[PDB]
Amino acid sequence: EAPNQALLRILKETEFKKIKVLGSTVYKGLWIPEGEKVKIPVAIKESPKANKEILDEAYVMASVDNPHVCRLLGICLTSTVQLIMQLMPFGCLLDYVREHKDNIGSQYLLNWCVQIAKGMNYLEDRRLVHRDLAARNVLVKTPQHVKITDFGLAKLLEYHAEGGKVPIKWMALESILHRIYTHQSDVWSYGVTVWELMTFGSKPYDGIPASEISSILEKGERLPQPPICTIDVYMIMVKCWMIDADSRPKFRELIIEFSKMARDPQRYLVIQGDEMDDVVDADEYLI
Numbered sequence: 001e002a003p004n005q006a007l008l009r010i011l012k013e014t015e016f017k018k019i020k021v022l023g024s025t026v027y028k029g030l031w032i033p034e035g036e037k038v039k040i041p042v043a044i045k046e047s048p049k050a051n052k053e054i055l056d057e058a059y060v061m062a063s064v065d066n067p068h069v070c071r072l073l074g075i076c077l078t079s080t081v082q083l084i085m086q087l088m089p090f091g092c093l094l095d096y097v098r099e100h101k102d103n104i105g106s107q108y109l110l111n112w113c114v115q116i117a118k119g120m121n122y123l124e125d126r127r128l129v130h131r132d133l134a135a136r137n138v139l140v141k142t143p144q145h146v147k148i149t150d151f152g153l154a155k156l157l158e159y160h161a162e163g164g165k166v167p168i169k170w171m172a173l174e175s176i177l178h179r180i181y182t183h184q185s186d187v188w189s190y191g192v193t194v195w196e197l198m199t200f201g202s203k204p205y206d207g208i209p210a211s212e213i214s215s216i217l218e219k220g221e222r223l224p225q226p227p228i229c230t231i232d233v234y235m236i237m238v239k240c241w242m243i244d245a246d247s248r249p250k251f252r253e254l255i256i257e258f259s260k261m262a263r264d265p266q267r268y269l270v271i272q273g274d275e276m277d278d279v280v281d282a283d284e285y286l287i
């Protein structure tokens with residue numbers, strides 16, 4: 001039972017500029033630590049229960065350090081508390097594949113699968129069940145480099161959920177029926193994640209409401225084989241969706257498998273046509 005010696009950095013409101021709203025509330029901004037001669041591009045995410053939730057997220061986000069996990073730079077305390085994170089200029093991967101589907105190649109797809117598996121296997125190393133793994137919750141720093149994010153529902157070690165709203169279609173069968181959550185439950189969601197990428201952002205079980213999903217998978221139904229997918233790739237998705245959680249693959253095995261395929265991508269995915277001076281990115285700002 002190791003002591004968590006992560007540092008929580010409290011940043012002065014004066015140290016950062018908010019340029020613009022990226023979505024709804026996240027802002028693009030610049031962080032200039034006092035007299036340190038750097039500008040860090042940042043994303044700022046700006047009720048008592050609401051602060052309880054947001055600080056629990058900062059707790060988790062500050063205890064992780066991995067190149068495919070979203071990095072917390074600090075918090076600012078305000079009327080409204082702010083999380084300050086590394087800016088991901090290309091947004092979330094779901095929107096990204098949806099917008100650039102006609103120019104995404106097999107090697108980017110397979111390398112995103114490797115990188116996400118690395119993030120997840122790192123979160124498993126630190127005994128953390130994500131519980132909301134999905135393409136909308138993977139962000140894009142560059143087309144070559146993605147990071148897992150948005151774990152307000154992440155918990156730390158099975159686990160028993162209480163009352164939260166849930167994704168259901170990204171969820172393992174045991175989670176839906178028994179509110180049980182494990183690293184292997186995450187692997188299920190990883191499989192749905194890979195499926196949304198391989199379909200370029202299709203909605204899982206589109207036009208079905210969550211009420212029926214439980215019996216659908218009880219019956220033995222799963223998500224379809226995406227057109228670009230050889231059986232090799234699709235079989236790995238199907239393994240993430242076994243009813244026996246221990247029969248599903250381990251994130252370290254998923255890394256290996258997708259790495260193998262990333263060395264020869266066109267064998268595994270068939271796609272038509274595959275063929276402001278002192279700025280520092282946060283991945284280079286350490287102290």
Ligand SMILES: *CCC(=O)N1CCCC[C@@H](n2c(NC(=O)c3cccc(C(F)(F)F)c3)nc3cccc(C)c32)C1
Binds near residue numbers: 024070091093
């Ligand atoms: C799937 C929707 C999407 O693209 N999002 C969701 C949140 C709105 C901001 C969007 N966005 C960012 N986000 C970030 O840079 C970011 C970094 C760290 C954490 C978070 C978090 F947890 F709050 F979501 C977000 N960056 C850009 C750049 C361009 C366009 C957009 C829409 C964008 C991401």
